[PDB]
Amino acid sequence: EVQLVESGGGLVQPGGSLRLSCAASGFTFSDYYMYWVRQAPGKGLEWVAYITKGGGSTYYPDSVKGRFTISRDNAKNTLYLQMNSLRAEDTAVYYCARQTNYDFTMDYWGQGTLVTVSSASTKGPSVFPLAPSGTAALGCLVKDYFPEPVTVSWNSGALTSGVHTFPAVLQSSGLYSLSSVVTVPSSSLGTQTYICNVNHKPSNTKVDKKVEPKSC
């Protein structure tokens, strides 16, 4: 089964340099032409690079020409994107994608790496409980962190239906916060326990908080 797994995204400072990688599995990598595509937060799709089967020809749009370099290691089945002189407008999810062997477009894509270019520094979040007072609601508030992203599970992936994790919001602090909530049977409140699992990999923060009706 065809797989494109990307890594190397992160936070890096203006003018800095970063190298993304994309590991291919499930097809003959050396047979395929490859691209990188980026997408700014809340924006559309921007083609960024193109490399031939072998590596002998490369193309880039002007926006990025000179600073980004696409390469490949067909022995390791891995595609790379070398980024230099990173400016603000390079913040984006970066996708790798293989070219159709039946046409000249983009057949299959990786999940993407977020690349954040900024002067601000990594900060972990505080996890606070949203406690329940039919159907009942509760959840976790995740306040003051940088950069994105943060991931929230419930009961370490067990509790999945009824969960809403909201888009992060940038506060005036220049820091982000969000909330995750789940709706549950009210009957289930005094019996089964509800734990959120907050993970902020940039700050190497992992926290599990349990929400219960508050001790008044």
Added chain:
Amino acid sequence: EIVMTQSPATLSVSPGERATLSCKASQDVGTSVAWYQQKPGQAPRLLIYWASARHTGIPARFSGSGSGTEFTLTISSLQSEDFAVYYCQQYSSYPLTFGGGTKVEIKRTVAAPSVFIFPPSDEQLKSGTASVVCLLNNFYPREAKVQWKVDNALQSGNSQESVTEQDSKDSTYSLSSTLTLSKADYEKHKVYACEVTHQGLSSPVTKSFNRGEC
């Protein structure tokens, strides 16, 4: 560069109906147009290539057409899962260009929100700031309004909201308003309210607590 224009950028279509997305080209691109479907938090997947050919594994109610400069994507028997942003792309000449995207919102029947208020945790109050949050759950359409009042004083310029993307199975939105305050001003007042209006509500819905009770 060849400029791909997708307009409207937004379309609201009822379940079961037929959506028609448009993609114009600043110059002739032949039939070297593709269409991608991008669901939230997900990589784009390829729907149509060669202007009208359907990628394998793609349901037959997706169909593309067009040549030259005017292209079209048509989603028949539209359903909740089809909520996505759809981009056209030309590969006739360099540089490769994507269109702006057209978000297809599924225009389901009106659903009133379910409101919930959460007072700040004591563990947060140990740090000087208190956050009071209000949840609006599984409603349609998107437009909904939230007013905070502390001791019946309407709050302003101290809240922030976030809406989820349209749900892929029931096509509703959910919303969170967050009131951020000093612990100082939090402790100087006692009743905290979240008041919600919405097209599915015959009359405004309020949810309250009194700081220090239960």
Added chain:
Amino acid sequence: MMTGTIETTGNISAEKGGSIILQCHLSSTTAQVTQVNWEQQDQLLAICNADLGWHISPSFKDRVAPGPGLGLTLQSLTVNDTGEYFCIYHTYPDGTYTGRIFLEVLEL
């Protein structure tokens, strides 16, 4: 087991700046030709897809025109065009047949 053969238009020497026709033909098989590629060792020039027709690679748009038939017309030859060209037939149920054309763009 795999009976077909490729004829070609033969190895080419041509002056800079002209246009020239390259073509192959598959014979002595009845397999269905699902796709024909034109390549250059590392570069894909054009795909004639069974029921869709011709697409020229975007990096060759104005250098290559499709046709005649399953062939190509290279348009304004430069010394850089010198090299081996391949017509690659994807067929069912025989498989992949390949024919080779060498092109030498001279500056007499």
